[PDB]
Design a protein around this ligand. Sequence first.
Ligand SMILES: *C/C=C(C)/C=C/C=C(C)/C=C/C1=C(C)CCCC1(C)C
Lengths: 247, 994
Amino acid sequence: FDLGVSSGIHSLFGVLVSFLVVFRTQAAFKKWWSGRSAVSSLVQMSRTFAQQVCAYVKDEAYVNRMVRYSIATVVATRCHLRNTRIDPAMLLGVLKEEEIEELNRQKNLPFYTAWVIRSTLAEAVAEGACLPLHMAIENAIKAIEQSIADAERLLTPMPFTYVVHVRTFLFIYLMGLPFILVEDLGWLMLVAVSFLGYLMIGLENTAVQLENPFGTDCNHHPLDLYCLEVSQDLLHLLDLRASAKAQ
Amino acid sequence: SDLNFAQVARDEGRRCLLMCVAFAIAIAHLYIYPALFGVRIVDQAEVPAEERTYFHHGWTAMLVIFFIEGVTVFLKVCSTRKTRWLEKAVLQKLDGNIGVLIGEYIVVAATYIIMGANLIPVFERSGRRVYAVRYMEWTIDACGLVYLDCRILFGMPFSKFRMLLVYSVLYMLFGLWAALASTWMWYAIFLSASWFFFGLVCYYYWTFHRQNPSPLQQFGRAPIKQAILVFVIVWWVLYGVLFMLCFQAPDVVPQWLEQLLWTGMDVVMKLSHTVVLMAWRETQWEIDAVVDRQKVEAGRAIAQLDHQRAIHERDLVRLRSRVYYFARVNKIFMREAGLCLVLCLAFVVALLHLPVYSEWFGVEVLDAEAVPHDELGFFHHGWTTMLVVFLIESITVLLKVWSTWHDPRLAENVAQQLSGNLGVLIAEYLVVGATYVILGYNLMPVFVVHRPGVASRRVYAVRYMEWAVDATGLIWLDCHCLFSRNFNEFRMAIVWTVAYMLFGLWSALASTWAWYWAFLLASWAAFLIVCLILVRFLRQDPYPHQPFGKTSVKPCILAFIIGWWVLYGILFMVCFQAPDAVPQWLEQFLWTGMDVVMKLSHTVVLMAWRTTEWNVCELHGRNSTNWTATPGLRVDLSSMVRLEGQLAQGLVTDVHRKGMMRSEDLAELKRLEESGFLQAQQHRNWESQTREMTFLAHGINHIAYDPRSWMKTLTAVRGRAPTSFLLWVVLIESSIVLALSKFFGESFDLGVSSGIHSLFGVLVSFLVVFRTQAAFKKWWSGRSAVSSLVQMSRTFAQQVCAYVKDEAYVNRMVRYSIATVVATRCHLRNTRIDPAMLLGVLKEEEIEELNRQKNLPFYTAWVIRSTLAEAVAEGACLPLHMAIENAIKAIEQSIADAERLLTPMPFTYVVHVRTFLFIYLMGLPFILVEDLGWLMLVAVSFLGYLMIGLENTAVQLENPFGTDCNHHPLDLYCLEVSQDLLHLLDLRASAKAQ
Ligand SMILES: *C/C=C(C)/C=C/C=C(C)/C=C/C1=C(C)CCCC1(C)C
């Protein structure tokens, strides 16, 4: 055989590809975390908006409109990241039907819900139904959309070049390992190459998974529970207000 | 039509498996019974050896057709798996014949193989040696044949099949029992019953003919379905005659004639059968008409969609922007007729001019019967196989024409199909056959070589000439029919291929390696440049989707071809360098097998290509998760198709569309494209179509990819990083070091050292990966900036349209916000604005006043602010104005970040890195060559590529804003924004009118 193993072709490639493959993973964990943060911030802003409205406003027909369409905004963004439309079953006791059919007739939903909210708040301010605390409300609305936009950034894939390079040289290293390992072993060379290949390739695919946090896979974020939480809280808030108003 | 894909494959499998099990068990049971039971004397298994060669020949010549079909149908099914209805069509065209044909070929080949193994000479009159398995495989073959014939011609699944099948098997087994025993002993008992059952099945055939005597709709005035039945039955008659005459007459020699007749007969019979079948199959049926009818409707519906959107847009833009604000046939034959003669004459010229220049001025001129025993047995195979293929193609064409003889209009179609391609195949086949015939029994000299080291290397003459000529054919074909090109661009490849083949020959003649390497290197060079030209031809293909229907079969073809070709060269090397490696007979066997396989594959691919719509004109012809970067941009079908039209094929992709389109519209389009490609042009124009075109034409160039796929990342070429002049320097250095270490022998004294190597390695590695992790971050920051800018613009517009009551200020503001975005996309690239991007949003004079400035976003913001002040003074604005001002402030921050991202990293940090990398690389060989040779070279090449590509990749990612394909797609964001705001104006207007 005359293997003539060489340290340069083996050790150097090893250290390089190892650096690369672990860095490409530490870079995806961060995106995962940033998505978590975005979601939490969105939820919190929604709740503050609802409280502000139900306290610093005195009418009752504007309040419903606003709160319910905020809920709709959340449910809409959970369906803008997955390129779908809405299932009425998720908006049963919060909206009337015609409103839902008018929603699904649009192209960008959160846009629409925010436009609605804003026109409604303007109506309110004109009729002196709102205390001087309105700028806070506007600012809350502004801060929701930032969260949305971050969540939307998180859908881009890493650039082509940086991935092609990594993958091809990994493939090379693996296809070259045996010719240098078989000199001193037999079947052990085989089992070792199997295990090592699994390690590396699994690292890469794990990074792929973590890259986009929003999806159906089991390691992704549970969007469907946050919506439920929000619905519960706001619909209880309406009743708190109503009771405290009747006395 | 309710078929599927799984059911058909399941049926094919089960049928062929029943065939195989029956065929094997019959022979096994006969073997078991004939030894101990009955009067069955078993001749010696060994003798003779001279008869097994014939059966081997038959074996090959049979395997060929299997391969042909098993490849063609695979091509078809894999080339149109993306369209339901073409799948329906093909799966209909092969209801149940495939499994049975495959089983037939498998069993016959297995039996003619077993003949070599010499399992049992059960032969027991005198002599007239016979073999048993022939009878079992004949049972199976005839039974499958009759099932096929009845099913196709009459459609009787279970009624006639059973009786005729049992008859066949019964009288075949009777004939077996009969011939196994002596003639006088047991002829009457069985052979008479055999003849009688033959007559019975003949009567059944005649009755079923009288029942349904209709011609095959595939054919026309052809006598088909009658000529073939007559031929088959008279052939069975001749077979029975031979059976009766073999044992009776001693005059007919049973040693060789006997052994040959059955092989010939079985082969020719099965071949006529399968060729008639393929001919009946390749004809166009009504299903194609159904599909074309489905297809045209799609273009119609598309034009309807376009008109509807046109009317809608017209009304909308009016509302918002108005109120509140026989010759051809004979020539198609004659061209091919001419080409064939050119090829023949060239081959004759070669064969005539070769030996007068060799062995008259050449050493080792004579080899007397180079090796009589081994070689001829290898060569007698090739010309036989090629003869087979020849006959197949010829009769197929003859049948096609015979079926399209009466109808003139149909004849011109096929005539045009066969143009430019048929002339090459016959020439290739016949020349290969003739050359390998010459080699079989040598009329031509053999030259040996004498050189230092070893001299037993044998060499053959003609093999090379044909190769060259041969190759050219392929070239002139594989670069013309596949990639539609004229002749002016083929010249170089032809001029260079013969060249490097001649150089390979001249080299091979002289293994002295004093001047051997010259022609070898020149040949490698010409071959390489040919490959480069070829891959360029491919990558500049105008019609890459046609005809194989949007698949990756063509590049794979090219890859297979090139790998084959370089395998030839590495074998050449392995042989002539180390003759101890090669036993020199295996070498000729391999050469022959490869020459066969290449042409087999080439012809099957051209066969499958001939029968596609692009040739046969109907409706057209020859004249989970969301990966994306634009989650807010959604497009409409009309624009997608208008775009795919206004561009060249192969620039848009599946994922390009999956990212810039909704899900429902995409599913609808997919359903609508089941029939074909859907290329069409409505030729409708508007004010918005221009804008959308101007943006998309620029935006598409950037790449979109699915990370989950591993192929399109490795095999990818386009988005890769460029390299520098350094690699060449390093290869130069290494090559001289190697040649010089060998010439200088051992006195190198490398004295490798761990400090100079390992330390430098770790340091430079750290540095180079850090310099890349530092650029990825800038890329990401730019993405963030862009998103924030877009979001702020939209919030500003909403705030304005809600918290303001006038209508002339609103327009001004919104439109100039759009202008601000389009301006910053042109401040990062140091250009000015193209009016086509601001058509329906601004008046001309405003644009000319813009382009007259130096810093544009400055100007737009100034405008906006003065306008908002005007508004506030006149009490036209609610108390919510500070929010508006703050939004304006927040836009500019985003802009400034994007502008930071144009600075380059500092000089010092880059100079240091680069120079020490260069050093490390230039030093590697002197320490590596001690333990290796050429391997040192290849390793340094690869490692250099890794490192230098890393650096250049970092360079690319450093500035994210540019034209390169890995950069950010600014032109789509602008489009998105325009759409949203111009819809917002209309929302407001409507809600104001009620
Ligand atoms: C039908 C057979 C064909 C087209 C075979 C062609 C053979 C070649 C293109 C091989 C060329 C070689 C080189 C790459 C250089 C060294 C010598 C050869 C012949 C092996």
